[PDB]
């Protein structure tokens, strides 16, 4: 379908493939264990 192909082309031109791969490649923050053994987990709503 020509309209579907055109829409996909526009959407594909809007966002580069590299800009999508890099975001996936961005690392996460792992929770850490302190000297006590308590779980020091950073807040979900404050980070990536």
């Amino acid at each position: 379908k020509g309209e579907a192909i055109r829409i996909r082309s526009i959407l594909r031109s809007l966002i580069p493939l590299g800009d999508l791969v890099g975001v996936i490649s961005i690392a996460f923050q792992m929770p850490t264990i302190a000297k006590d053994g308590n779980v020091v987990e950073p807040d979900m709503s404050a980070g990536f």
Binding site: G2, R6, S9, I10, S13, L14
Partner: protein, 208 residues
């Protein structure tokens, strides 16, 4: 008696540029031999520098409706607002089209406007839309109206770009008012008579 644009007419696309608060008329130009990209030719300093209008002229080869163009791709008409028009470069015999490529003129979402060898595909077709509210879709286009051109392939406006110091033309998402100016009409022309923009030879002595 208002005059109406129809197919087989030779026209030039003009855009108004306001640089350093100075209105300047620019024409869409291309040199189809060796440079498929399109540029702009100034036509406001004609009293000091003559413009190269030999390459700024385009011919309205065809004017089909949106559905007609769609069924074309699936398998003298007066221009009405909303039709898809085919613009043929007069000098190069090429067709104006969206190149689907960019020269990275800051705006990464814009696509370059150039010329294409063939008429196949949806890149060579542009839709004409009314400028202000005194016109409507289906109403016949006047010789002194501003027109908005949208590429069928990319749904991008024929845009005048102020990106760098110079001025560019490309298919972007910001609209620019283009004024179509009539150059000549083939039907009303007279065969064997001098017309403007003719390459000719001046036979002086005894036709030799």
């Amino acid at each position: 008696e208002i005059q109406f644009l129809r197919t087989d007419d030779e026209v030039v696309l003009q855009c108004t540029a306001t640089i350093h608060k100075e209105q300047q008329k620019l024409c869409l130009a291309a040199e189809g031999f060796g440079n498929r990209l399109c540029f702009l030719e100034s036509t406001s300093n004609s009293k000091n520098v003559p413009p190269d209008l030999s390459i700024c002229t385009f011919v309205l080869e065809q004017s089909l409706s949106v559905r007609a163009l769609q069924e074309m791709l699936a398998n003298h008409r007066t221009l009405l607002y909303g039709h898809a028009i085919l613009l043929r470069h007069s000098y190069s015999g090429m067709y104006l089209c969206c190149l689907s490529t960019s020269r990275s003129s800051t705006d990464k979402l814009a696509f370059d406007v150039g010329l294409q060898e063939d008429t196949t595909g949806e890149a060579c077709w542009w839709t004409i839309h009314p400028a202000s509210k005194q016109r409507s879709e289906g109403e016949k286009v006047r010789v002194g109206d501003d027109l908005i051109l949208v590429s069928v392939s990319s749904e991008r406006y024929l845009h005048l770009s102020y990106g760098n110091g110079s001025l560019h033309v490309d298919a972007a998402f910001q609209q620019t008012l283009w004024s179509v100016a009539p150059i000549s009409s083939g039907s009303e022309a007279a065969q064997g008579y001098l017309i403007g923009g003719d390459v000719l030879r001046l036979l002086h002595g005894h036709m030799d």
